Curated annotation (Swiss-Prot), chain D:
Taxonomic lineage of the native organism: Eukaryota, Fungi, Dikarya, Ascomycota, Saccharomycotina
Record's function text: Short-lived chaperone present in the precursor form of the 20S proteasome and absent in the mature complex. Required for the correct assembly and enzymatic activation of the proteasome. Also prevents premature processing of the PRE2 propeptide.
Tree of life domain: Eukaryota
PTM remark: Seems to be degraded by the proteasome upon its formation.
GO terms for cellular component: cytoplasm; nucleus
Miscellaneous comment text of the record: Present with 2740 molecules/cell in log phase SD medium.
Name this protein carries in UniProt: Proteasome maturation factor UMP1
Annotated Pfam families: UMP1 (PF05348)
Keywords: Chaperone
Organism: Saccharomyces cerevisiae (strain ATCC 204508 / S288c) (Baker's yeast)
Similarity remark: Belongs to the POMP/UMP1 family.
Curated annotation (Swiss-Prot), chain E:
GO MF term set: endopeptidase activity; threonine-type endopeptidase activity
Active site (record annotation): T24
Protein family according to the UniProt entry: Belongs to the peptidase T1B family.
Reaction it catalyzes: Cleavage of peptide bonds with very broad specificity
Source organism (scientific name): Saccharomyces cerevisiae (strain ATCC 204508 / S288c) (Baker's yeast)
Quaternary state and interactors: The 26S proteasome consists of a 20S proteasome core and two 19S regulatory subunits. The 20S proteasome core is composed of 28 subunits that are arranged in four stacked rings, resulting in a barrel-shaped structure. The two end rings are each formed by seven alpha subunits, and the two central rings are each formed by seven beta subunits. The catalytic chamber with the active sites is on the inside of the barrel.
UniProt name for this protein: Proteasome subunit beta type-2
TM annotation in the entry: none
UniProt GO cellular component terms: cytosol; nucleus; proteasome complex; proteasome core complex, beta-subunit complex; proteasome storage granule
Subcellular localization(s) per the UniProt record: Cytoplasm; Nucleus
Record gene name: PUP1
Enzyme class: hydrolase
Lineage, opening ranks: Eukaryota, Fungi, Dikarya, Ascomycota, Saccharomycotina
Keyword list, A-Z: Cytoplasm, Hydrolase, Nucleus, Protease, Proteasome, Threonine protease, Zymogen
Swiss-Prot record, chains H, J:
Nucleus listed as a keyword: yes
Catalytic class of the enzyme: hydrolase
Family the entry assigns: Belongs to the peptidase T1B family.
Natural source organism: Saccharomyces cerevisiae (strain ATCC 204508 / S288c)
Subunit structure: The 26S proteasome consists of a 20S proteasome core and two 19S regulatory subunits. The 20S proteasome core is composed of 28 subunits that are arranged in four stacked rings, resulting in a barrel-shaped structure. The two end rings are each formed by seven alpha subunits, and the two central rings are each formed by seven beta subunits. The catalytic chamber with the active sites is on the inside of the barrel.
GO BP term (any one): proteasome-mediated ubiquitin-dependent protein catabolic process
One Pfam family matching this protein: Proteasome
Lineage: Eukaryota, Fungi, Dikarya, Ascomycota, Saccharomycotina
This enzyme's EC code(s): 3.4.25.1
Domain of life: Eukaryota
Protein name in the entry: Proteasome subunit beta type-1
Further remarks about this protein from its record: The side chain of Thr-10 acts as a nucleophile, and the N-terminal amino group acts as a proton acceptor. Present with 7250 molecules/cell in log phase SD medium.
From Swiss-Prot, chain I:
GO cellular component annotations of the record: nucleus; proteasome complex; proteasome core complex, alpha-subunit complex; proteasome storage granule
Residues of the full protein shown: 105 to 156 of 260
Gene for this chain: PUP2
Subunit structure: The 26S proteasome consists of a 20S proteasome core and two 19S regulatory subunits. The 20S proteasome core is composed of 28 subunits that are arranged in four stacked rings, resulting in a barrel-shaped structure. The two end rings are each formed by seven alpha subunits, and the two central rings are each formed by seven beta subunits. The catalytic chamber with the active sites is on the inside of the barrel.
Protein known as: Proteasome subunit alpha type-5
Compartments, as annotated in UniProt: Cytoplasm; Nucleus
Length: 191, 189, 210, 142, 215, 223, 254, 205, 52, 205, 143
């Protein structure tokens, strides 16, 4: 499981890979590593099977309940804080499980994109970049990142990261699903 | 390239013996002879090859000195002492010796543990990984004082029944040994 | 740390006939080298023409048989003395075994009786409840000696269907005699329960070592 | 006559062992949303890797109370533990304060803890639940 | 030279990587003019009876006999080596071998290997000094007894011996007592069964070896 | 408990033509130290049943308390407690076996081995064994511990099968039990010379002999 | 107050029969143990039940060992009007003779099927339980349960016991009017994957390659059955199932 | 036995005689090889004429003794002076019911006008034994023979004092965990008497 | 197996008893008796077609 | 000790008296709780009037004793009768130099014209201690006090015999590894005298 | 006065510790071809994972003889061990039979093993390099 997040001047771009659980030949067309928390907030997760999906769906249900109750959408910051609280609460009385979360949103009130990363212990960091899974990409991102990048330039940088990563993957790296969150909502890039 | 394990069965007849081993059909056979004495070894393949080479060496020297072929009992004692020499580093093998004495004409079979303890049997010897299922089949099928054709049929049926109960390229090699003639047969299942 | 399990070393065999069933077992109870008793039955009549055996750790088997008999008593109480069929008993035993999934009974269980068409039926259970209907099942020590003996003289594919009850009893006795000769844990007696439309009949035969 | 609490481990488990939080869609399964525990806490994880002193601390006062009741039964008779238990049950049942968690004054007097403090006193201590109606339903059994 | 230690590391490595290395009632009774040794005749490879008629009474010398338990190959090898040494010593001294000499040889050989040769023995015999019975442990300790038992059925045999032993026993009484102890081991122990083998060594006579004395 | 501390060794019992005989020595050993002499390990429950217990002594005293409570509860409030409503050996054994298995399943076993001996109301002999695992069995001869390896082969000489029971008198059975006790005192390092015996006969009732000593010991074959 | 008096009035404690659960499990008060929709599972009352179970499940009698489902190849796919489920019926012999042929696929309903691929007892027991749950749901809602709901029920149940010792990998295959034909895969780790083609077995790469070589949505029923049989034969006689909106149909060796 | 705890390595004796009972002990408390307390009173009173000495874990035995004294005060408030058998039974129940968590051994000595002086011993495990005399502790192992050779029934008070003094002096001489002064309590019908003996006195025996 | 129609009817009646002490000794479950009557129609192999 | 080895759970005493020395022991050998030998002779002769008893590993002590007897024969062929001190020194050297591989303890009792009977003890480790009397073994721990109260210098033969009999009877009474008969050897200027006492004798002391 | 062999482990190692098979190209390194051990046997591998009994068996007879010599020195004097060692040295030196490995008769007479058999006697215990008479000549003469 590999997740990448890049925040640009006007949007957030999230890339995620497929599962391939354990020696099971699966042909399917879906994204099982992404849950839409709200029309302008998306969540990507990578970690242990079973636990991570349960946690993601629990978070999605809570946020949908809030949206129905208040007839209003939480900001990405509040969503990320709630996710951090729930993650720290889950391992309160059990052995921690491997999980890493990237939350990408677009604050309509502030009119700006935001990206957060939360690790398995419950550490939330606001970042312009982000990656989890395979362990070089940080050096390339540091070398080729500007806070005022457009969406096309961010997509090109993501393509460069994908091309660099593919040369070390064992040739089983299928199509990486890429989604964009911006003022118009959430969409999926065909390419 | 994986040839470890296997099964070897030895039975006594009226004035004959039968010794049979499993095979992979399709050059690694687990039955060797040093004149009129036959040896079948199961277990680690490297140890099987090493023991075959060592016993060919020792029996060639024995025949050069004695100017006569070695008898099954003397070969059994030799195998026992050779296995006991490696007391703390033993080969991972189960050997079985079969033959007919050239002078008295009495048939002889025996089995060994990995450090050379002798089990001299009058009916049959089973060596292999399981040695519990084929053992029961041989116990149900064996009858004493069989003619060579009856003994061949019995041992072949035991091997076939073992093969059926737990494959694809399974084969068998059978030796019917009389005082004057030795017949080697293949079973292709 | 305390070890709650043990091993008592028995041998059981169940055979389904055309219109009868047979469940037999050796009657020796041992503790790993010593003979606790030379006559300790392990095949029990449970009512409604059902015979049961749980071989392995003796305490677990006794507990399972006790629980099944009490459940059958309540089944008669709550359903107007309805006869419990063999498949329903098999399902009850599956639930009883799987109820201890995380602390299992250390037993192998065989039950025998007649199905709703009057034909013989034998069910075998894995220690945590997995079960199936079989024509013939040997369990415990010396099963690897008993099954080939039966297969040498019966075509399960004289065909087993046309065998009579006396012939089956003789064949079981012969297989157990051979196993007693070849195995150190088998002997001292054999007990056979036969289920037919007339009920359950008991037979006993002395084996070696008295 | 127990000093350290005993028999604290569970002997059976089931997916409906918590009657308070059960799914209405599938009544045999628990309701993960209304549990509000992080959403990734199966019951099995609660059966292993606990601190050895936790069960001793959680059941300590109940064990001492039971030993006192047993001594009263041995020395005084059935009536004394019966009366003590009746008093405590009446006091506990007539109290319903959904906005507070503190024990009553009369409960402290009955427990002989009017001038005693423990760490439970110093340290008495969502999207769904934690409201008055949930406490009403739990208290009334409806 | 001697017993080899080659392939010890290889065998340990195979054991660590999931490669399974492949893998009795005896009594001795003294009587007024000699000693008897008796044994069961069942040989088992685990729970399976390999042989129903197995000879377990072994001859160190014409009038010195022994039986063993533990590792069978070790027992046979040690008995044969000490027999060769005893025969050579007898030829060298031009005298009948003494049981104490065999006891010393066995004790020192077993002590040299520090218990790694798993041989547990009962050794009986008669020599020009009289009749002797000894028990020998794997680590090199030896003991003298008027009646001894060995094997997995040794407790039942010892009970029978404690029930019916006296200072002054005739040859027939001793033979019957030893046979009864072996029979108790046969009936009450799963490791013992089949027939009984007896060997009677009397002062001034040839050793009498009775195989299948009671079937 | 989780490990025995003070223990008793062995109980041996046999069936004869009209009843049962049971016996056990009087010693509570503290490791290798022979600490307590004068421990009664045969408990008469009524006039038709004797229970012999080996193993942990504190658990044995707990079992004695359970048996006393059972006897007292039998008479609450049946006026026929001494009459046909008296406790049977089978009732006592069923209760004890249920307790032992339940405590084994609780991972808190009673580290004991128990033999129940007696005569049923119809004259039948009852002889049963249950241990800390809840394993139960019956036989014409029963023993625990070292006796199970030494006393049993002797007693099976007298009573080898069920057909030998009618041929065995009380004198022969008592002699066999006494000889087995002597053998145990010979070859058991945790044994005692003093022992108690109990005979339950369908005609004469219960005879409980205390302060019995092993006698006629052969030590003269020193050299 | 009289109940309080009874609690303090003086055998039952040692039997542990003052607890209602112990009475129910031993069928003292009635057959309520056989009346629980959610079955009760016994756990060792110690600090480390999981270590206890793992240690005691890997130690002598072949007949007292937990039976493991066959690791033989199992295939499932959805072509145009149903689901083809294919297994190899080469049973493994032992110390027994079967009265009839065994089946590697559990018939949960006339409309639902599952595969074992794990511990045999776990799959059989919990898929029978799932059939009961689906029946109760269909009675309540007066409509056939969706395959997503049934797979979710099974996944939630197995996740509640995650790490306890269960082992099971099943493929829930169904066909409903609203969903169409659907296949899910549920594992004892809590995984729940929706898919079009699933191949789980000893040799499944060969079958997956054969499928991908000649897979299309426009396959016919006979063509789909032939393709499934050929894929199983390539993997390593062959039991086939065709699932349509009206239920499943079994083919012995078609 | 929990790590870092305090153990009661001691020498305890209790002897019944003609007029009553006597309980004696040493006065040494050691942590490892260091004598943490050179002067300790090990004779614990649970009732006016019912005393005890403790072995095993110090904390566990202290808690058990406190509970026993409380229980006997309740009993006295209800029924009067208890017998030594009742106190022994309460001690046994406390020690046995908690033996999986506490390590306690008790020697109980008592006097009453009915039974006229008694000794009970509860070793580790929770079993109870009534004896004419009892010895316990790490230093008792060295005087098993001597006591067995020198005890007589119905001895006078002075003979009992001398016997206990000699036996405890030998136990002190041979056991490292024992030493200091000898303390004795005499329980008779005339009351309770306290005695102390110093090393310069008993070491010359 | 299918449950007998009479067994199901008995179970429903045992539930209806719950305004007082239960059939197996259970505590009271509801504050008043039900206000409904049921006609239960079934078929089983033991007793054929039944109406309760 | 080595796994599966035979240990020596004995009761050994050696007492010096006016005319010489007496060495005594019990006759039990155990394999845990089973008595493998009811009647074993634990009194080992190393020279004509130099005897010993052994503890620890049985095989190691037998090998050491055989080597020491060989050494004393070699010494005798050259210089004549060896002193008890020389035998003790040889025992000590063998036990100390091999203490990393062999477990062995020895009690040596000897008589010679110069020194008139001596007792040496070599505990585990290999140190040597010359004593007026020595005790060793599992049962010895139970008679440390009694012996300390009952030993006098220059006792008669009968008094020493009675003292050893009483002490070993108590050791047999309390220790489970100590057994049936008591064997003693008296070494004086007259010669070597062997004595044996049976349970019916000493159990009534 | 030892019984079990002691001080058997090596206190230091070096690459030229075996003077017989030193390389001619690099004298500080051993010659792996003439070792004929298999080509993949570093010396360090011989310092770990040995059988605990191998050292005891290898040095047993030497330890017993050293104890015997010490006893002779203690009881007889220096001359007795001196003469025994001198006799053994003379017998061992004047025997050079490159085609056989059996011990001499006179050595066994001096060792008091005339009628004694051990597994060393029963099991006395192909190559391209160093299996010739000349290697033994060089080793014996120190060439």
């Amino acid at each position: 499981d590999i997740i990448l997040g890049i925040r640009v001047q006007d949007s957030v771009i999230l890339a995620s890979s497929k599962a391939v659980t354990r020696g099971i030949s699966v042909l399917k067309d879906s994204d099982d590593k992404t849950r839409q928390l709200s029309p302008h907030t998306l969540m990507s997760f990578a970690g242990e099977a079973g636990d991570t999906v349960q946690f993601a769906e629990y978070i999605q249900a809570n946020i949908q309940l809030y949206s129905i109750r208040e007839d209003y959408e939480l900001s990405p910051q509040a969503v990320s804080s709630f996710v951090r609280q729930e993650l720290a609460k889950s391992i309160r009385s059990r052995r921690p499980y491997q999980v890493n979360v990237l939350i990408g949103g677009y604050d309509k009130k502030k009119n700006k994109p935001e990206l957060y990363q939360i690790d398995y212990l419950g550490t939330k960091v606001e970042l312009p970049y982000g990656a989890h899974g395979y362990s070089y990409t940080f050096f390339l991102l540091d070398h080729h990142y500007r806070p005022d990048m457009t969406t096309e330039e961010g997509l090109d940088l993501l393509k460069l990261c994908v091309q660099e990563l593919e040369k070390r993957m064992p040739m089983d790296f299928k199509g990486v699903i890429v989604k964009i969150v911006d003022k118009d909502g959430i969409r999926q890039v065909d390419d | 390239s994986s040839i470890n394990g296997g099964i070897v069965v030895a039975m006594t007849g009226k004035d004959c013996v039968a010794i049979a081993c499993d095979l992979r059909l399709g050059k690694f056979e687990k039955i060797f002879h040093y004149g009129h004495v036959f040896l079948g070894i199961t277990g680690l393949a490297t140890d099987v090859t090493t023991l075959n080479e060592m016993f060919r060496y020792k029996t060639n020297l024995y025949k050069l000195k004695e100017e006569r072929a070695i008898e099954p009992e003397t070969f059994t004692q030799l195998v026992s002492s050779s296995l006991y020499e490696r007391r703390f580093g033993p080969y991972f093998v189960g050997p079985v010796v079969a033959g007919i004495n050239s002078k008295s004409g009495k048939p002889f079979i025996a089995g060994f543990d990995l450090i050379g303890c002798i089990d001299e049997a009058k009916d049959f010897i089973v060596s292999g990984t399981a040695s519990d299922q084929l053992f029961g089949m041989c116990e149900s099928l064996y009858e004493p004082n069989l003619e060579p054709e009856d003994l061949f049929e019995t041992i072949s049926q035991a091997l076939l029944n073992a093969a059926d109960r737990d494959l694809s390229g399974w084969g068998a090699v059978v030796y019917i040994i009389k005082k004057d003639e030795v017949v080697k047969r293949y079973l292709k299942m | 740390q305390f070890n709650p399990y043990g091993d008592n070393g028995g041998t059981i065999l169940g055979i389904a006939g055309e219109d009868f069933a047979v469940l037999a077992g050796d009657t020796r109870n041992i503790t790993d080298y010593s003979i606790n008793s030379r006559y300790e039955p392990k095949v029990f009549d449970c009512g409604d023409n059902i015979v049961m055996s749980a071989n392995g750790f003796a305490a677990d088997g006794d507990a399972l048989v006790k629980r099944f008999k009490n459940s059958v008593k309540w089944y008669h109480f709550d359903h107007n003395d309805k006869k419990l069929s063999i498949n329903s008993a098999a399902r009850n035993i599956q639930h009883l075994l799987y109820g201890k999934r995380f602390f299992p009974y250390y037993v192998h269980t065989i039950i025998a009786g007649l199905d709703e068409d009057g034909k013989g039926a034998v069910y075998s259970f894995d220690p945590v409840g997995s079960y199936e209907r079989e024509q013939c099942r040997a369990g415990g020590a010396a099963a690897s000696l008993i099954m080939p003996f039966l297969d040498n003289q019966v075509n399960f594919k004289k065909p087993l269907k046309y065998l009579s009850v006396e012939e089956v009893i003789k064949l079981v006795r012969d297989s157990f005699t051979s196993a007693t000769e070849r195995h150190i844990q088998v002997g001292d007696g054999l007990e056979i329960l036969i289920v037919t439309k007339d009920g359950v009949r008991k037979e006993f035969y002395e084996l070696k070592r008295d | 006559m127990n000093i350290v609490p005993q028999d604290t481990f569970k002997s059976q488990v089931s997916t409906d062992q918590d009657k308070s939080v059960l799914s209405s869609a599938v009544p045999s399964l628990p309701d993960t949303l209304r549990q509000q525990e992080g959403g990734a806490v199966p019951l099995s994880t609660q059966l292993n890797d606990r601190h050895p002193l936790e069960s001793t601390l959680k059941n300590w006062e109940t064990t001492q109370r039971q030993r006192q009741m047993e001594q009263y039964r041995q020395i005084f008779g059935i009536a004394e533990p019966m009366k003590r238990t009746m008093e405590m049950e009446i006091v506990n049942r007539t109290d319903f304060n959904p906005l507070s968690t503190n024990g009553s004054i009369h409960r402290d007097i009955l427990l002989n803890k009017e001038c005693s403090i423990d760490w439970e006193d110093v340290y008495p201590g969502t999207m769904v639940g934690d409201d008055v109606h949930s406490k009403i339903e739990k208290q009334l059994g409806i | 030279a001697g017993l080899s230690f080659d392939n010890y590391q290889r065998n340990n490595f195979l054991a660590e990587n999931s490669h399974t290395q492949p893998k009795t009632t005896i009594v001795g009774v003294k009587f007024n003019n000699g000693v008897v040794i008796a044994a069961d005749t069942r040989s088992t490879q685990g729970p399976i009876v390999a042989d129903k008629n197995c000879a377990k009474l072994h001859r160190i010398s014409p009038k010195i006999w022994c039986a063993g338990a533990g590792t069978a190959a070790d027992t046979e090898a040690v008995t044969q080596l000490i027999g060769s040494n005893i025969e050579l010593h007898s030829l060298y001294t031009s005298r009948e071998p003494r049981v104490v000499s065999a006891l010393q040889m066995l004790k020192q050989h077993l002590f040299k290997y520090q218990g790694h040769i798993g041989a547990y023995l009962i050794v009986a015999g008669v020599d020009p000094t009289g009749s002797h019975l000894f028990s020998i442990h794997a680590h090199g300790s030896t003991d003298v007894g008027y009646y001894l038992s060995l094997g997995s059925g040794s407790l039942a045999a010892m009970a029978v011996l404690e029930s019916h032993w006296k200072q002054d026993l005739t040859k027939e009484e001793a033979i019957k007592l030893a046979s009864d102890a072996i029979q108790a081991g046969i009936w009450n122990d799963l490791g013992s069964g089949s027939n009984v083998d007896v060997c009677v060594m009397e002062i001034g006579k040839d050793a009498e070896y009775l195989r299948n004395y009671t079937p | 408990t989780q490990q025995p501390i003070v223990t008793g060794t062995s109980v041996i019992s046999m069936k004869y033509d009209n009843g049962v005989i049971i016996a056990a020595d009087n010693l509570g050993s503290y490791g290798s130290l022979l600490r307590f002499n004068g421990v009664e390990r045969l408990i008469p429950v009524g006039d038709n049943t004797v229970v012999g217990i080996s193993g942990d002594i504190s658990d044995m005293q707990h079992i004695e308390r359970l048996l006393k409570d059972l006897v007292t509860e039998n008479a609450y409030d049946n006026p026929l407690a001494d009459a046909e409503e008296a406790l049977e050996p089978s009732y006592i054994f069923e209760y004890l076996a249920t307790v032992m298995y339940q405590r084994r399943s609780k991972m808190n076993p009673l580290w004991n081995a128990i033999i129940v001996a007696g005569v049923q109301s119809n004259g039948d002999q009852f002889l049963r064994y249950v241990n800390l695992l809840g394993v139960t069995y019956s036989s014409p001869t029963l023993a625990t511990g070292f006796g199970a390896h030494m006393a049993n082969p002797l007693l099976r000489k007298v009573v080898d099968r069920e057909s030998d029971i009618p041929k065995t008198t009380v004198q022969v059975a008592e002699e066999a039990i006494v000889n087995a006790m002597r053998v145990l005192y010979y070859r058991d390092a945790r044994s005692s010379r003093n022992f108690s015996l109990a005979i339950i006969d369908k005609n004469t009732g219960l005879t409980f002999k205390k302060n019995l000593q092993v006698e006629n010991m052969k030590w003269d074959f020193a050299k | 107050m009289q109940a309080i008096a009874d609690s303090f009035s003086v055998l039952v404690k040692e039997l542990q029969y003052d607890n209602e659960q112990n009475l129910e499990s031993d069928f003292v008060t009635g057959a309520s143990q056989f009346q629980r929709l959610a079955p009760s599972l016994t756990v060792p009352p110690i600090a480390s039940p999981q270590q206890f179970l793992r240690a005691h499940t890997d130690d002598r009698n072949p007949d007292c060992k937990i039976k493991i489902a066959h690791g033989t190849t199992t295939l499932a796919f959805r072509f145009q009007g149903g689901i083809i489920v294919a297994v190899d019926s080469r049973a493994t012999a032992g110390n027994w003779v079967a009265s009839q042929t065994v089946k590697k696929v559990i018939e949960i309903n006339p409309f639902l099927l599952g595969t074992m691929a794990g511990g045999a007892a776990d799959c059989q027991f919990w898929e029978t339980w799932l059939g009961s749950q689906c029946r109760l749901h269909e009675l309540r809602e007066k409509e056939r349960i969706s395959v997503a709901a049934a797979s979710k029920i099974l996944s939630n149940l197995v996740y509640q016991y995650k790490g306890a010792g269960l082992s099971m990998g099943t493929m829930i295959c169904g066909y409903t009017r609203k969903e169409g034909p659907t296949i899910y895969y549920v594992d004892s780790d809590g995984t729940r994957l929706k898919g079009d083609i699933f191949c789980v077995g000893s040799g499944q790469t060969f079958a997956y390659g054969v499928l991908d070589s000649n897979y299309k949505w426009d396959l016919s029923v006979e063509d789909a059955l032939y393709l499934g049989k050929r894929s199983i034969l390539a993997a390593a006689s062959v039991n086939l199932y065709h699932v349509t909106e009206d239920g499943w149909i079994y083919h012995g060796n078609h | 036995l929990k790590k870092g705890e305090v153990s009661l390595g001691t020498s305890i004796m209790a002897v019944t005689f003609k007029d009553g009972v006597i309980l004696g002990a040493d006065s040494r408390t050691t942590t490892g090889a260091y004598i943490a307390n050179r002067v300790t009173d090990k004779l614990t009173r649970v009732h006016d004429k019912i005393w005890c000495c403790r072995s095993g874990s110090a904390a566990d035995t202290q808690a058990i003794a406190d509970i026993v004294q409380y229980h006997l005060e309740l009993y006295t408030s209800q029924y009067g002076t208890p017998s030594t058998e009742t106190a022994a039974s309460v001690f046994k129940e406390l020690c046995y019911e908690n033996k999986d968590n506490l390590t306690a051994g008790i020697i109980v000595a008592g006097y009453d006008d009915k039974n006229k002086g008694e000794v009970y011993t509860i070793p580790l495990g929770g079993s109870v034994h009534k004896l004419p005399y009892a010895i316990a502790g790490s230093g008792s192992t060295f005087i098993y023979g001597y006591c067995d050779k020198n005890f007589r029934e119905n001895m006078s008070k002075e003979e009992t004092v001398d016997f206990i003094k000699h036996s405890l002096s030998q136990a002190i001489k041979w056991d490292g965990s024992s030493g200091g002064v000898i303390r004795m309590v005499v329980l008779t019908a005339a009351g309770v008497e306290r005695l102390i003996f110093y090393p310069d006195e008993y070491e010359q025996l | 197996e299918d449950i007998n129609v009479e067994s199901l009817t008995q179970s429903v009646c045992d539930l209806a008893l719950r305004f007082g002490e239960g059939a197996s000794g259970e505590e009271r479950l509801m504050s008043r008796p039900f206000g409904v009557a049921l006609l239960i129609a079934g078929h089983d192999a033991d007793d054929g077609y039944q109406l309760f």
